[PDB]
Design a protein around this nucleic acid. Structure first.
Ligand SMILES: [Mg+2]
Ligand SMILES: [Mg+2]
Ligand SMILES: [Mg+2]
Ligand SMILES: [Mg+2]
Length: 166
RNA sequence: AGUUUGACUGGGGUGGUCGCCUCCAAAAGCGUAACGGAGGCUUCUAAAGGUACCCUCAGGCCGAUUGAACCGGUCGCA
């Protein structure tokens, strides 16, 4: 509930002013922050799948699950049964507290960030180091917004404090 | 010493075949031949059985660390 007040009390009263909606339901609202990482190396050494679960739980605070394969590709020794991914889907306040742990301490501990979305307004971040966080083989981060285009998504994105670029 | 030592077959022998399943030949009911054209079987599951409740693939595109694998979105009667 750190950026929650900053969004409803403060950030919302400015988005309607600029884009000029006739209501308050047209303004973008990120609804979840999905985190994921690929463990193709575990196809031959699967002891590093449990360790990923333990690490992917200390960061967000909520338990994660393995992701099972879905294809039959020999070039990755892949048959449709192996656990090769770990995902966590933060939502509501759980992503709100997590977001503040990242904009202030994660980007600061980097050794800023690209500006390119999928086109529907969902910025996704792949950081190649897991020790960028406090609790800690990178991991994907995706903020699924309620926006329509990149224009609406960007305004929600920069208001939070994402370092972005230019 | 008494006997046995298959049949089909564009002559016989050599080769191939011999029971069962699916398609075409088959002429819009059923059936229907060729040493006509194609493939399979001689199993499997203690759940891959029963029921209640629930769910939806393949592929392409855009985004994204190691990346046709993982995640987000969306076009998708399959
Ligand atoms: Mg006699
Ligand atoms: Mg004869
Ligand atoms: Mg008929
Ligand atoms: Mg007839």
């Amino acid at each position: 509930a750190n950026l929650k007040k900053d969004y409803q009390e403060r950030i919302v009263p400015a988005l309607m002013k600029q884009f000029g909606y006739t209501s308050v339901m047209q303004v973008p609202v990120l609804k979840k922050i999905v985190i994921n990482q690929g463990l193709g190396m575990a196809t031959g050494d699967k002891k590093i799948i449990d360790v990923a679960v333990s690490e992917l739980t200390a960061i967000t605070g909520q338990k994660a699950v393995p992701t099972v394969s879905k294809k039959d590709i020999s070039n990755f020794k892949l048959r449709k049964k192996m656990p090769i991914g770990v995902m966590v889907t933060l939502r509501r306040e759980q992503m709100y507290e997590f977001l503040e742990r990242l904009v202030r301490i994660a980007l600061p501990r980097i050794r800023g960030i690209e500006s390119k979305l999928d086109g529907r307004g969902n910025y996704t971040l792949g950081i190649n180091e897991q020790i960028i966080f406090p609790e800690i083989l990178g991991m994907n981060i995706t903020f699924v917004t309620s926006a329509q285009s990149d224009e609406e998504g960007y305004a929600l994105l920069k208001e939070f404090g994402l370092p972005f670029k230019n």
